[PDB]
Design an enzyme around this catalytic site. Structure first.
Site, PDB file in Angstrom:
ATOM      1  N   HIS A 104      -1.044   1.650   7.662  1.00  0.00           N
ATOM      2  CA  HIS A 104      -0.590   3.016   6.148  1.00  0.00           C
ATOM      3  C   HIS A 104      -2.058   3.664   5.432  1.00  0.00           C
ATOM      4  O   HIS A 104      -2.064   4.319   4.812  1.00  0.00           O
ATOM      5  CB  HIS A 104       0.654   2.946   6.910  1.00  0.00           C
ATOM      6  CG  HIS A 104       1.131   2.067   5.109  1.00  0.00           C
ATOM      7  ND1 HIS A 104       1.103   0.515   5.897  1.00  0.00           N
ATOM      8  CD2 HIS A 104       1.122   2.436   4.071  1.00  0.00           C
ATOM      9  CE1 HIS A 104       1.547   0.255   4.158  1.00  0.00           C
ATOM     10  NE2 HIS A 104       1.372   1.348   4.022  1.00  0.00           N
ATOM     11  N   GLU A 141      -0.018  -2.481  12.052  1.00  0.00           N
ATOM     12  CA  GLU A 141      -0.690  -2.010  10.798  1.00  0.00           C
ATOM     13  C   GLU A 141      -2.211  -2.806  10.602  1.00  0.00           C
ATOM     14  O   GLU A 141      -1.601  -2.762   9.562  1.00  0.00           O
ATOM     15  CB  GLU A 141       0.643  -2.618   9.650  1.00  0.00           C
ATOM     16  CG  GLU A 141       2.310  -1.503   9.471  1.00  0.00           C
ATOM     17  CD  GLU A 141       1.593  -0.109   8.047  1.00  0.00           C
ATOM     18  OE1 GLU A 141       2.382  -0.759   7.340  1.00  0.00           O
ATOM     19  OE2 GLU A 141       0.440   0.364   8.645  1.00  0.00           O
ATOM     20  N   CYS A 156      -0.850  -3.155  -0.798  1.00  0.00           N
ATOM     21  CA  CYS A 156      -1.050  -2.908   0.083  1.00  0.00           C
ATOM     22  C   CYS A 156      -2.290  -2.677   1.192  1.00  0.00           C
ATOM     23  O   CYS A 156      -3.518  -1.878   0.584  1.00  0.00           O
ATOM     24  CB  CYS A 156      -0.620  -2.220   2.040  1.00  0.00           C
ATOM     25  SG  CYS A 156       1.526  -2.274   1.475  1.00  0.00           S
TER      26      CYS A 156
END
Ligand SMILES: COC(=O)c1ccc2ncccc2c1
Lengths: 172, 171
Positions: free
Chosen positions: B28, B52, B137
């Protein structure tokens, strides 16, 4: 950790020290240059040096760091406190290493006798070496934590075991 | 030579150089509009996505200063990993995580699949450098095994409370 706390951490001898106020500098006794007779332009005659084992405090008769406000310095912290050790590393990298603090202890580390507040790193397992742990160049780096609305300093980095898991904070 | 030099700003987060030709990130954070990454045309980049976790394999050495590292599909339950968090301040924040089971978890409304973990920094961050934020992230999960550093995934998600995290893994 706030920019005003990083600005207080200054290169000193074989390690680091920390400006508590415009007149008060703390550091680890063993990083101090042995033959030195002058600090920040001032003669030794004009500085009050308070030594307790591996903790040394310098109190100057003039404002060396007038950009700073005076902050709280305490004699260690409660068991269970999480502190950050404000370590600077080659290239403007800033390493605030997380440490859970334990009891005041006397230990033998690399054959030297060491007395201070023990703690255990919260960075990783088997934290030997520079990526997750301390190196000898880190001695004098401050142990800090946040309360309600303010930050406290409670000691300076004095020693680490060979495994890297245990550190010792020298205290006032 | 440092692990930290492999952690690289990328899209809306970070990624990690496993070798001179292999880069891993959180799916993402990857830009959805691009013709090139790190100066190499996307036409010459192999992209392998499993939820992911995304791996890029380049046809030229982008980071020839690095040796190849061990990449594995998660780690044994109970392993203490470090998440290698970089911040735009210049702060480096290695945080211990006790790794758990492979799971699907609803983290603030979204379903995320990966290796569950519990931060070992306690309480909250309490406005201290002790937890993750959304901009972290893609940060790598690593641990020392014998004399070898192992990388076993990338930071995908964290609960509001902060203490549960999800590490996305290969395959
Ligand atoms: C391998 O480490 C443990 O046994 C351990 C120790 C402390 C923990 N604290 C919070 C959550 C999980 C924990 C797990």
């Amino acid at each position: 950790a706030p920019p005003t706390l990083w600005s207080r951490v200054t290169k000193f001898g074989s390690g680091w020290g920390f400006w508590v106020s415009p007149t008060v500098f703390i550091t680890t006794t063993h990083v101090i240059p042995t033959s030195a007779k002058e600090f920040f332009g001032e003669p030794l005659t004009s500085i009050a040096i308070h030594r307790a084992g591996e903790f040394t405090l310098f109190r100057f008769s003039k404002k060396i760091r007038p950009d700073l406000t005076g902050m709280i310095l305490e004699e260690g912290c409660p068991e269970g406190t999480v502190c950050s050790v404000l370590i600077k590393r080659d290239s403007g990298e800033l390493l605030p290493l997380a440490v859970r603090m334990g009891a005041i202890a006397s230990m033998r580390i690399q054959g030297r006798l060491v007395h201070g507040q023990s703690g255990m790193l919260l960075t990783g397992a088997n934290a030997k070496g520079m990526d997750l742990g301390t190196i000898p160049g880190d001695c004098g780096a401050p142990y800090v934590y946040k309360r309600a609305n303010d930050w406290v300093v409670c000691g300076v980095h004095a020693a680490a075991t060979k495994s890297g898991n245990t550190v010792v904070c020298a205290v006032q």
